[PDB]
Every structure is written in C-alpha cells, then in structure tokens.
Amino acid sequence: MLTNSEKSRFFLADLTGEVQSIPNTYGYISNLGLFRSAPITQTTFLMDLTDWD
Amino acid sequence: MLTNSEKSRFFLADLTGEVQSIPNTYGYISNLGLFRSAPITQTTFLMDLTDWD
C-alpha cells in the first residue's frame, strides 16, 4: 500500500498496518455466580428481622 | 407483597421476606449416650460398699 511521503506530495512510501490496544477488563467476581437476581416493581423494599435466646 | 410506604399512607413499597436467627445448642455429650435411665419411686436411694485386702 503506497501512500504520500512523510514531507512531500510527490514521493511515495509503504504503509504496513495498524497496531491496536485495548484496556484490561477484570471479571472474576462477576462470573463467580454468587449474587442472585431479584427483580422488583417498586422504588424501595422492606425486610423483617427476628431472634430469640 | 405490597405494603405502605415508609412515611406515606397513600404509597406502596415491596416487602422482601424475613430473616431469623436462632441460638446455638451444643449436644455432644448427650449424643454420646454414656448415662442410663434408672427411674425410681422414692425421693432417695441407697447403696452398699464392700472390700477386702
């Protein structure tokens, strides 16, 4: 693939290709499967607690 | 299940179950079954001890 030179409009130079970089993305805990899914239909929710000795 | 909001009688919010806690109960020695049941009729009992040399 011939392209324009570095500092001239009439000479040609050879282009090789691209070098892509992608950031790292850790996903250990996400795929561990600990957390369950509990969809709700309200802005908030409540919960009760109990105990005895 | 839907219930009243935190501070409004005319709004609803979701109630997500309950959580319970129970005290611990160790039973190791009872399960060992060392002791026998010897029911009696009176409020006291006696025994005899003997020996020789």
XYZ file of C-alpha atoms in Angstrom:
106
model
C 0.000 0.000 0.000
C 1.738 3.121 -1.295
C 0.970 6.478 0.315
C 2.267 10.033 0.321
C 5.769 10.514 1.701
C 6.470 11.970 5.140
C 7.150 15.525 3.936
C 6.446 15.526 0.190
C 3.408 15.395 -2.083
C 5.156 13.635 -4.991
C 7.166 10.750 -3.484
C 5.674 7.547 -2.102
C 6.186 5.391 0.978
C 4.992 1.949 2.040
C 2.341 1.509 4.735
C 2.347 -1.716 6.759
C -0.670 -1.729 9.066
C -2.198 -0.750 12.390
C -1.394 -1.660 16.000
C -4.489 -1.775 18.212
C -4.539 -1.515 22.004
C -7.447 -2.444 24.278
C -7.713 -1.808 28.044
C -7.858 -4.638 30.549
C -11.201 -5.774 31.989
C -11.283 -7.992 35.079
C -14.379 -10.119 35.590
C -13.549 -12.572 38.376
C -16.325 -11.857 40.879
C -18.921 -11.233 38.171
C -18.676 -14.760 36.747
C -18.353 -16.386 40.183
C -22.145 -16.693 40.329
C -22.570 -15.759 43.991
C -25.142 -12.997 43.533
C -28.758 -13.790 42.667
C -31.253 -11.677 40.713
C -34.412 -10.437 42.464
C -36.363 -8.025 40.244
C -38.920 -5.799 41.961
C -41.644 -3.388 40.851
C -41.130 -0.541 43.331
C -38.657 2.165 44.274
C -37.736 0.557 47.620
C -38.302 -2.581 49.675
C -38.583 -3.646 53.312
C -37.438 -6.608 55.386
C -38.231 -8.040 58.822
C -35.856 -9.409 61.455
C -36.423 -11.813 64.337
C -34.400 -13.534 67.049
C -34.673 -15.162 70.465
C -32.398 -16.615 73.132
C -46.063 -8.353 48.705
C -47.003 -4.671 48.792
C -47.280 -2.598 51.969
C -47.468 1.061 52.925
C -44.511 3.315 52.231
C -42.094 4.415 54.936
C -43.939 7.630 55.810
C -46.980 7.879 53.496
C -50.317 6.086 53.774
C -51.100 6.539 50.060
C -47.957 4.997 48.524
C -46.762 1.404 48.311
C -43.460 -0.425 48.697
C -42.328 -4.034 48.444
C -41.735 -6.280 51.470
C -38.937 -8.795 50.835
C -39.463 -11.669 53.213
C -37.931 -12.155 56.643
C -34.662 -13.126 58.336
C -34.402 -15.215 61.507
C -31.638 -16.052 63.974
C -31.625 -18.990 66.391
C -29.341 -19.619 69.402
C -26.760 -22.387 69.397
C -27.386 -25.713 71.173
C -24.420 -27.966 71.927
C -25.273 -31.614 72.497
C -22.048 -33.580 72.115
C -22.083 -35.437 75.428
C -25.813 -36.206 75.411
C -25.393 -37.839 71.999
C -22.549 -39.906 73.461
C -25.131 -41.922 75.405
C -22.984 -42.738 78.428
C -25.703 -42.481 81.081
C -28.539 -44.952 81.634
C -32.018 -44.106 82.860
C -32.792 -45.588 86.291
C -36.227 -44.324 87.337
C -37.194 -44.858 90.968
C -40.289 -44.442 93.113
C -38.957 -42.581 96.167
C -37.065 -39.344 96.760
C -33.811 -41.045 97.822
C -31.854 -44.252 97.301
C -29.073 -46.209 98.985
C -26.103 -48.398 98.095
C -23.703 -50.808 99.797
C -19.902 -50.777 99.555
C -17.647 -53.728 100.401
C -13.971 -54.619 100.106
C -11.178 -56.836 101.408
C -7.384 -56.997 101.451
